[PDB]
């Protein structure tokens, strides 16, 4: 009845065909750490944090965009899984500036939480650290593109949901700006949703900008007005 056996960490589970490895690991409750996978957008393999080891295999595969063959056995806490995660984390924190005090996602970043719970302790990379000139996406969205990790999730969101097609990658190598080439104010509907999509503090809110910090403000359930959907 369309069932495939996957042994997540030895424990067996039946999984429908076609789904990714990460949906199976979330079917058993695990979380493989991730930056450019998102459960509402198309799957791209840019961030490379999502790597996981399959038993009896030389290479380390990407759990975001790997279909399920018959009878897997997946090690989420093996040796080279942890070595690959600490490696990718040590690459990501190189060209990322020292802005964690002045940043706006300082309580709710993902580089910080994953560099705690998966990454290394001592750093390296004595010299370098590129800096990119920031843009002006809109008067509603403050934009510091120095903090960008080029995960390409704002672009997939704009193109597949907002339908605007204004955000683009430009350049090669380290020089990959993510933005509008023509100084154009990205002004459309659902433009506010892009600040929750960007996982690092690059595309942040303009009126909220420097007024709070998320470990103090308490959360409360509520229902919208002014829209019939609520």
């Amino acid at each position: 009845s369309n069932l495939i056996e996957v042994f997540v960490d030895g424990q067996s589970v039946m999984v429908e065909p076609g789904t990714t490895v990460l949906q199976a690991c979330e079917k058993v409750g695990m979380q493989i750490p991730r930056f450019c996978y998102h459960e509402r957008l198309s799957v791209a393999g840019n961030c490379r944090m999502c790597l996981v080891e399959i038993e009896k295999a030389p290479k380390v595969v990407a759990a975001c965009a790997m279909p399920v063959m018959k009878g897997w056995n997946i090690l989420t806490n093996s040796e080279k899984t942890k070595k690959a995660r600490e490696g990718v984390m040590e690459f990501l924190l190189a060209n990322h500036p020292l802005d964690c005090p002045i940043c706006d996602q300082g309580g709710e970043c993902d580089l910080q939480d994953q560099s705690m719970m998966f990454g290394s302790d001592r750093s390296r990379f004595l010299e370098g650290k590129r800096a990119v000139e920031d843009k002006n996406i809109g008067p509603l969205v403050k934009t510091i593109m120095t903090r960008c990790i080029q995960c390409t999730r704002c672009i997939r969101f704009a193109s597949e949901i907002a339908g605007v097609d204004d955000l683009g990658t430009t350049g090669r190598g380290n020089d990959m700006q993510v933005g509008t080439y023509i100084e154009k104010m990205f002004m459309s509907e659902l433009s506010g949703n892009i600040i929750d999509i960007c996982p690092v503090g690059a595309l942040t809110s303009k009126p909220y900008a420097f007024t709070a910090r998320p470990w103090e403000t308490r959360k409360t359930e509520s229902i919208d007005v002014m829209d019939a959907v609520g």
Binding site: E79, K82, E86, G119, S120, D121, R122, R124
Partner: protein, 56 residues
């Protein structure tokens, strides 16, 4: 210290410890303040190409 001989002798006689040499007033062996600035060593970390956090 810096007291005369008679009261020193009566201190030594009223308590036979030869009290002059150790008397708990610190005069010269206070540690000289504004020491030279220190360089602090780093222990068994920071060695490049072994510090995988999966080990420790």
């Amino acid at each position: 210290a810096s007291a005369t001989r008679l009261i020193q002798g009566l201190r030594n006689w009223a308590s036979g410890r030869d009290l002059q040499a150790k008397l708990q007033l610190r005069y010269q062996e206070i540690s000289k303040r504004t020491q030279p600035p220190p360089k602090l060593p780093v222990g068994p970390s920071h060695r490049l190409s072994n510090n995988y956090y999966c080990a420790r």
